[PDB]
């Protein structure tokens, strides 16, 4: 059932999602990451929580094109860590496949 006041990451019917960590919300505003995102497509769904943020575009082909982009933009003075909600970067090393 439709749950009010969440932040989560459950398949129940999306796709083009966006995992903005390491946002300096104590500074970045969500217009700064709605904006800002705004030159990666259009956002339909756009939430930053203390910690964090998540960025939902029109279509993934978006999405995936700010996690490559804004990806590692200096706000504030300092690097945001963002990837698709999909493949967690964990364990760099290692063979990576699938």
Do not use: W
Request: charged letters at 20%; hydrophobic letters at 35%; one cysteine or more.
């Amino acid at each position: 059932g439709s749950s009010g006041s969440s932040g989560k990451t459950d398949p129940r019917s999306m796709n083009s999602r966006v995992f903005i960590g390491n946002l300096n919300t104590l500074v970045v505003k969500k217009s700064d990451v709605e904006a800002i995102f705004s030159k990666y497509g259009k956002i339909v769904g756009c939430s930053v929580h203390k910690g964090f943020a998540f960025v939902q575009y029109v279509n993934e082909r978006n999405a995936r094109a700010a996690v490559a982009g804004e990806d590692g933009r200096m706000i504030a003075g300092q690097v945001l860590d963002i990837n698709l909600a999909a493949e967690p970067k964990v364990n760099r090393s290692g063979p990576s496949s699938g």
